[PDB]
Amino acid sequence: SHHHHHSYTVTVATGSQEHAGTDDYIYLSLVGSAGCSEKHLLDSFERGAVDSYDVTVDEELGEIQLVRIEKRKYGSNDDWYLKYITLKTPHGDYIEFPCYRWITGDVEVVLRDGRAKLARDDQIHILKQHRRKELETRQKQYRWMEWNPGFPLSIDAKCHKDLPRDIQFTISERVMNHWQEDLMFGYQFLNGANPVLIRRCTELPEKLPVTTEMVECSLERQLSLEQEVQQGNIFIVDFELLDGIDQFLAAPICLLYKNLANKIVPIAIQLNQIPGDENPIFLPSDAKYDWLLAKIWVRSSDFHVHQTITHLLRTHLVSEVFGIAMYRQLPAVHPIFKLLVAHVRFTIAINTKAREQGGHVQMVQRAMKDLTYASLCFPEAIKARGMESKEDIPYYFYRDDGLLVWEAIRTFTAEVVDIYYEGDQVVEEDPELQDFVNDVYVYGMRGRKSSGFPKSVKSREQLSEYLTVVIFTASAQHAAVNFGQYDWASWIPNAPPTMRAPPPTAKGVVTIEQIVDTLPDWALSQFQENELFLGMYPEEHFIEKPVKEAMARFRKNLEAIVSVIAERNENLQLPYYYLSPDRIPNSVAI
Ligand SMILES: [Fe+2]
Structure with a gap:
């Protein structure tokens, strides 16, 4: 009997996004250490629905290693978004199998249970074969392509339609009144949209x-x-x-x-x-x-540096590099996949829908030389500009708030790294981690020696730093340079997107007229109802208690940072809130 909310006990959770449901035949198979079960037929899987089944096996399978899902078409194919499967086994054990993937019926989907595993942990053939085939499938489906000459390599997809289905989809007032003031002009270099x-x-x-x-x-x-x-x-x-x-x-x-x-x-x-x-x-x-x-x-x-370099190149394209490298080289069961997948959510699809829709190319090519790893390590990058001393430069709120969020993410990645890697040798010997880092260096960053990107990672410290780069770039840095765009660039004179006259070549000549003749004749700054903010992890890739405790510590720490920033902003002339963690999305999704 089948119980639908909205022997083995099988629970199937369908996604809540639209079109997540399917009317098609769903077949389930269990692969245990002692044998496989026959294909059982489940009968529709509606959006938001949880369907539960009682499945009696023909034999005793031992500890369940894998779940297999085949979707045969009932009439017309119907994409199906599967969140997870769970089992209560005849021996009383409860096993969770995270999925979070679309199932189009083109292939079998095979899931590990959710306990995170390094390659070193998988020694039986059932598991080594699954992992190897998964990576071979990943590296055929997620490939590198040079979209524009000299750019970081991106996804081999011309249209959003061609991506693998899984990765598819007051200050304004103040500016208007004060944009001619030297103070406001200077303030923006520290706390505007491009700081x-x-x-x-x-x-x-x-x-x-x-x-x-x-x-x-x-x-x-x-x-x-x-x-x-x-x-x-x-x-x-x-x-x-x-x-x-x-x-x-x-x-x-x-x-x-x-x-x-x-x-x-x-x-x-x-x-x-x-x-x-x-x-x-x-x-x-x-x-x-x-x-x-x-x-x-x-x-x-x-404005132009900000759009093309600060924003597009250094947050969007960098994040996409990390995301392609992750899909190509880390299997689903790997703990760094589980950690990073929520921070590259939608990054590739956003960039792909933009590409499908001259001088801007040159700016990227010229900035590639400065797209270094050190430049992405926020504390070191502040210091490299000489801007680090808060005693000296006291009103640099982008620095102050970035430092706290950088340190919070660093604390979190270190706790995660220490749960799954017992020492520095385990990090160095993780072949999938080494291939992930190497793909970034060689394909994403073109193999340029001067990028400073690591060719390999050989300690827990270095890996924590590297994961903090990936997560901070996709979340905090992107929010700081993206969500102030309406505040600071909605008053055209403060941020002209084009110019209609050449710059003045002498003094005492320009009129208010000539200023008007030079100047020209919101979408990207909004959040969504669905928006996931830093440390919200509704897709439970991690299911283990130690890492879940680390995630809760991460949230509590971000909550303390929100309070610090709110109390700082209470006394400020013009609040700086772009790096308040309740406003920082997990990923580049806009
Ligand atoms: Fe963006």
């Missing part, structure tokens, strides 16, 4: 011939400009990557100053790289609209 470019200047670049006389009115400590550099109070945003893209663009240098109120404000702007009479150093002491238009041009450049 990753500014760095501490340690000597003035020869290509920016600014003098203490030019900026004396902006300096407030009775020091020369070169003395202020040496005291660490001068910062720079340099868009030289835009230089040499041939749809009008510039490649500005923007010099900034930490004033006595400890706020970083712009003090000089050169709109192109090569200094000259027709490339002036604009200053806040210039005519109102000279300085205003210089700033708009920097806002335009920051």
Whole structure:
């Protein structure tokens, strides 16, 4: 008798997404250590439904190793999303078999129980054959393809339809009123949509011939400009990557100053790289609209770097690399698959629907040189820009909140790594982990030595760091650069997507008219009702108590971080909440 909620006791859970149900014939087989069962027929599996069956075997099978599912068409094929199967066996044991896959009827689906296993744990043929065939199937279905010259390699799929079925689908107001203010312009380099470019200047670049006389009115400590550099109070945003893209663009240098109120404000702007009479150093002491238009041009450049580099290349395409490497080299039963699969959810499909729908390609090609592993290790990357000291640079909330979430994910990956890897040798000898890391280096990052990506991982520490890169990039870093886009780029003058006139080549000439003639004549910033936020793991790939306790500790820690950020934001002029963990999605899904 069959009991449907909404010998062996078999429970089948159908997904809650639409079209998850099927009307087709479902056959179940049990593979035990002492024999296999005949194919049993189950009779429809509706969306959200849990169907339970009582199955009597012809013989005693021993400990159940695998469950097998075949979907024969009843009339027309009907894709079926299977969440999991469980068994209560004749010997009283309860065994859970995580699936979370679409079943199209094209092949048999064979599931391990949910206890996570390294290759080293699988010594009987039944299990070694399953694992080997799974990886061979994965590496035929998930392949590398060069979409555009020089890009990280992506998925071998022209259309979203061609992907394997499993991986298919107030601040605005403030900007409007204050976008002309030097303070607001400076604030965004630390806490707007693109807070990753500014760095501490340690000597003035020869290509920016600014003098203490030019900026004396902006300096407030009775020091020369070169003395202020040496005291660490001068910062720079340099868009030289835009230089040499041939749809009008510039490649500005923007010099900034930490004033006595400890706020970083712009003090000089050169709109192109090569200094000259027709490339002036604009200053806040210039005519109102000279300085205003210089700033708009920097806002335009920051926008384009942000869209193509900060966002697309360094979070979307990087996350897709990690996701393809995971599907190709880690079987479902591997603990790093179980950990990472929720953080690459939808990443490949999002990128694929974008690709199907010149100068932007060059920007990616030029930024590949800086797409390093160290650049993705958030604490080290902050320090490499000289921005680490909170005593020195006190209003860098992207840094402060990133550090806490980076450290929370690091704590979690370490606990997980220590449950499943007893020492450093087990990490080094894990052949699937080594092939996963190697695919990233060789295929995703093209094998470029200067990427700094590890060729192998040989300790628990190093593996924890590497998993934190993957998870932080897909979750926190993506949210910080994606969800402030409506706040900061919905007022066009603060973020022009195109420019209709060339940059001004002299002072005292631009009018409010010329500013209007230069400027042009929300989708990606929204969350969804389904949205899964950092540490929500409804798909139970892990079923074991130790890792489940580690996940609960991870959530509690993220909850403490939410409270810290909320109490910090209570006292702030303009709250920074993009890195509050209740707002950080698990993955790149938008
Ligand atoms: Fe995104």
